[model samples]
Target: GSTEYKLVVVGAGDVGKSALTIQLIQNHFVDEYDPTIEDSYRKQVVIDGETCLLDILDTAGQEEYSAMRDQYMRTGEGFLCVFAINNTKSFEDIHHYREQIKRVKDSEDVPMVLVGNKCDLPSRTVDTKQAQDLARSYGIPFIETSAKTRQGVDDAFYTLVREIRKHKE
Candidate 1:
């Protein structure tokens, strides 16, 4: 069987949302010095054994845009809810992020990946166990990934697609 899936990678602003998007789409990391624009989006990413038409919606991570988070979540068949593992604040924000997905998705059963990103930063260690527990509470899979190192980056999206397809099948 063949199918198409929409993958949405979302997180707080400056938490490396664009960085992760670019790496997944372009297969290369954009340096911190690289310039970024507002409400920018790019289509990138090719999942194996599947024709993935990626629409990388890079929305502004501002208070004003918080009202619209559900709008994005409503469109995606699958989502990667990202948070910087090294930053406690980012980890905390995942709660609200997950809430937005639940509310806008119209169901709590949507397949989602709880991504603990920035795993390459060993010096900035945060509570990994707690993050996993949060994912458990949300009943979603968890992954520790580093966009710079490309660690678990591909697996994150592939697992998502696999799971979605498995359910649909």
Candidate 2:
């Protein structure tokens, strides 16, 4: 038997949202930064030695799709709040995404993971301490991932799935 989970990837534009998702599902790293309107990917993964199906929604990061974001938030069982380590603005905007998820779900304790993407980059504006501090404040797991190097990518997803499963229990 396999459990099903719906996860949403949210963040500011050009923050490697698509790249992370693509890398996870297809095992391919994308070099080009393409903006996503909205895309859904389904994959079966084993988390904690249990088979699970993940329905991940890769959302549009642009402000123009703010209205559609609420819908995605409502449907998501868990959220991966991603930000690029090289972009300070994206790092700062994570609060808005968390707030929206809380507001839409009407709960502050929603399952979530804070992901710092582009960890392979040499020039990073956001440090590990800052990200860990924010995640600690929210009582969520903080993970640094590099879609380019595929580092910590699977851990990020697995952590969120485990969180979601725990929440359901």
Candidate 3:
């Protein structure tokens, strides 16, 4: 049997939300920084020997999309709440994203992964402990990923998928 899950990639603008999605599905890194309003990608993945379809919605991180987040949250089964490690403001804003998800879903126990992107960069502001502490408080998984190096990208998505699967069971 095959399962389908709706995943949302969300964060502040220029935080590598689109880049991460592009890399995961296309296996290529995008160097340009383009603000995305909305984009969707579909990919089939096998997790724990179970075949599943991941229908991902990469949402715009700008404040203009603030109103639309509730709609996106309503449709998403799981979320990759991403932030750039080099930007402390982006990391700090993650609480807002998580709060919006819980408010829109009306559930505190939402399936989500706290993702710290751009880990390859040397000028890091948000360290692992900060991310881990936040995730620990929320009881969600925290993963660091570098879209350029393709590190922990697959694990971030797979962990969220696994969490979504567990939620269904």
Candidate 4:
């Protein structure tokens, strides 16, 4: 492996954060449950000719886990904030998560991505353009994803690695 990315999955509770993290790490879908407080998924992949060690943290956010959240936020080099397209509150919850990241990392331009999860589901609550705009406003990348179909899953993770690369260098 070349470089290691300390990445965190940020979002409101039950926004498929676990599903998204599990999909990327294990390459499968989980609709059931995890009684654990959080998930730490690790894998190595080559992106753009460079090998990367991805250490992904899926923090349990509805308790929003103040205890667990800060350490991961403090250590994480990059982040993917997931919001279900059908859940507007999850989308609304995205801002403060970013703000917390900034306050913890103490940097505005930390490598980050805005992910609209559950894209495979119907009846979207958050518009695509709105997500794009928010991401643009934050100066980060935006991706629409589905843990079920694995749509944009790789890109969401990979793009964050790329962002980490650029930001680090």
Best by lDDT: 2
Residue 46 of model 4 has an lDDT of 85
Runs with alpha carbons beyond 4 Å of true place in candidate 4: 61-69
User: Candidate 4 lDDT, tens digit per residue, 21-120?
Assistant: 9889889999866635686788988889878888898887355547665765699998898898999999998988888888888887888999999999
Best model number under TM-score: 2
What would the per-residue lDDT of candidate 1 be over residues 1-169, giving only the tens digit for each residue? 3255677777776667767777777789875723245343444345665566555555443554464655655787777888887777877788787777677778767778888888888666567788788888887889888889888887887877776776566
Estimate candidate 3's alpha-carbon lDDT, on a 0 to 1 scale.
0.89
Clashes of 4: 1
User: What is the TM-score of candidate 4?
Assistant: 0.92
Question: Candidate 4: worst 10 consecutive residues by lDDT?
Answer: 61-70
Candidate models: Cα lDDT each: 0.72, 0.90, 0.89, 0.87
Candidate 3 lDDT over residue span 88-156, tens digit each: 999989989998888888888889999999999999999899899999999999999999999999999
- lDDT, model 1: 0.72
Off by over 4 Å in 3: 61-69
**How would you order the candidates by TM-score, starting with the best?**
2, 3, 4, 1
Better of 1 and 3 by TM-score: 3
The better candidate by lDDT, 3 or 4, is 3
> What TM-score number comes out for model 2?
0.93
Off by over 4 Å in 1: 33-48, 65-72, 166-169
lDDT of 1 at 121: 86
